[PDB]
Amino acid sequence: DHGMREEILGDRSRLIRQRGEHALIGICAGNSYFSQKNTVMLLQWAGQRFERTDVVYVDTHIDEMLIADGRSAQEAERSVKRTLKDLRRRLRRSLESVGDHAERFRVRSLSELQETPEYRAVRERTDRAFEEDAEFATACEDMVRAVVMNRPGDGVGISAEHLRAGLNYVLAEAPLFADSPGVFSVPSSVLCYHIDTPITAFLSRRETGFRAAEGQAYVVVRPQ
Numbered sequence: 001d002h003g004m005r006e007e008i009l010g011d012r013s014r015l016i017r018q019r020g021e022h023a024l025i026g027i028c029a030g031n032s033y034f035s036q037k038n039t040v041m042l043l044q045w046a047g048q049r050f051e052r053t054d055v056v057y058v059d060t061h062i063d064e065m066l067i068a069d070g071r072s073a074q075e076a077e078r079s080v081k082r083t084l085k086d087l088r089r090r091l092r093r094s095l096e097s098v099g100d101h102a103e104r105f106r107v108r109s110l111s112e113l114q115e116t117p118e119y120r121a122v123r124e125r126t127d128r129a130f131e132e133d134a135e136f137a138t139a140c141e142d143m144v145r146a147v148v149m150n151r152p153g154d155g156v157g158i159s160a161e162h163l164r165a166g167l168n169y170v171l172a173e174a175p176l177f178a179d180s181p182g183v184f185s186v187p188s189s190v191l192c193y194h195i196d197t198p199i200t201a202f203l204s205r206r207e208t209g210f211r212a213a214e215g216q217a218y219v220v221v222r223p224q
Contacts (some may be wrong), residue, residue, distance in 0.1 A: 004223045009196065010204035013217035022186040023050035024176060026193060027057040029087050030152030033194055037221060041095040045221065046192065047101035054184050055107040057091060059084055060172050061113070064165035069155035079215060093126060106184075113183070122175035122182050129178070130171065133210035135202070142198035143170045170199075181215035187216050188215035194222040 008014050027034055046053040062083065066076040073119040095102055113119055129136050144166035149160060175182075177199045180189035191200065203212040212218075 001044075002224070003195060004038075004045060004221060006045075007220040009218035009220060012212070013095060013190070013204060013219065015187045015218060016215060016217035017190055019188070020050045020190075021052065022180075022184065022189040023053040024184070024189050024191050025136065026057045026089070026176065026191070027055065029058060029062060029083050029089070029204050031087065034090070036090065036094060036097070038194075039090070040088060040097040041223060042192070042221065043094060043098045043105070044101075047098060047104055050190070052186065053097075053103070053105050054180075054189075055105050056113055056176065057107070058169075058173070059087075059109040060111050060166060061169040065151055066153075068102060068161040068165045069151075069153055070157075087163075107174060116183075118185055119175055119183050122179045123171075125176035126178055127171060129210040130174070135206070136210045139198050139202035140167070140170055140174065146198055174199070177212075178210075179213035179216065181213050186215070189219065190217040190219050192219050192221050194220065196220060205211050 008017055009012070018172060025042065025046060043053075043055075057119045062080050063076045066079055067073060071079070077190065091107070095105065098105075114123075130140050131137070144163060147169055148162050148166045151162075177191065181187060193200070200218050203216070206212065
């Protein structure tokens with residue numbers, strides 16, 4: 001046990017971070033980074049730094065991209081069930097490796113979290129913002145491109161259908177990016193991820209118009 005590095009995304013997040021109230025951990029299917037080694041390293045780090053840590057595993061809109069990638073509707077669902085079986089198995093071993101701090105974690109899938117009225121309350125605001133705030137709409141569009149361009153699989157082509165799947169996926173996530181304090185009902189939250197992303201880069205720095213909720217902070221955490 002020899003830990004990993006932490007960088008704070010923009011001045012705005014600096015004071016919210018130091019207190020270490022809440023951490024949001026976003027996990028992704030098909031991303032090499034979420035190998036047992038790093039997931040366990042990440043989970044233990046948030047247990048030692050944050051008094052409350054929400055873990056969300058993305059299980060939504062994967063189906064759409066596979067159909068866009070040229071796979072049958074039934075071919076898509078079969079794959080998704082397989083991809084999520086392995087993610088759940090990986091996650092079970094990851095949290096098992098942390099143990100004692102499992103009480104300090106609130107692990108749920110995105111679709112499960114989608115059910116929550118507090119999620120739906122923020123989603124209402126984020127979807128409106130994508131259509132109204134040009135600045136945020138633009139940030140979302142770069143995040144869509146980034147999602148499509150880095151999608152899992154042997155797919156190579158890019159169509160309008162891929163973009164919708166991209167936008168759908170990105171819109172399901174936006175509440176967690178914009179108002180995590182409101183989604184999880186916490187006074188403040190820190191979105192933790194191993195890289196800067198178009199959305200985070202926009203929300204970490206934004207001062208006017210649609211922006212991050214007071215309490216929303218961003219930190220980049222990766223191995224040393």
